[PDB]
């Protein structure tokens, strides 16, 4: 796999994930980016006095 | 002026044983999986030599 790789090898940059079977919610999975930012927009939806 | 002389031548044887053883490993029939690439795409196949 380093031979097919040629000049650049063993250099992971980003890993995408997906569901094998299909059901309920589509689950195209790379929302992890907004997981470290645990509550970016969801905490404050429409709160005003 | 050919000078190959047969007698041518041678032878041887033886045985042884012791024991031882040783351790590794084995040798004596290894198979080589050559990969050819001429553009971004690639083909790969296996062969054997004794």
Swiss-Prot record, chain A:
Entry's localization field: Virion
Coiled coil: none
Function: Capsid protein self-assembles to form an icosahedral capsid with a T=1 symmetry, about 35-40 nm in diameter.
Subunit structure: Homomultimer.
Official protein name in the record: Capsid protein
């Amino acid at each position: 796999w380093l031979v097919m790789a040629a000049t650049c090898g063993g250099g992971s940059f980003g890993i995408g994930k997906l569901k094998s079977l299909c059901k309920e919610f589509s689950v195209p999975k790379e929302l992890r980016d907004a997981l470290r930012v645990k509550y970016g927009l969801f905490g404050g939806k429409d709160s005003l006095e | 002026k050919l000078l190959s002389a047969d007698r041518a031548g041678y032878d041887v044887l033886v045985e042884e044983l012791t024991l031882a053883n040783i351790r590794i490993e084995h040798h004596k029939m290894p198979t080589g999986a050559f990969t050819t690439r001429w553009v971004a795409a690639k083909r790969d196949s296996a062969l054997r030599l004794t």
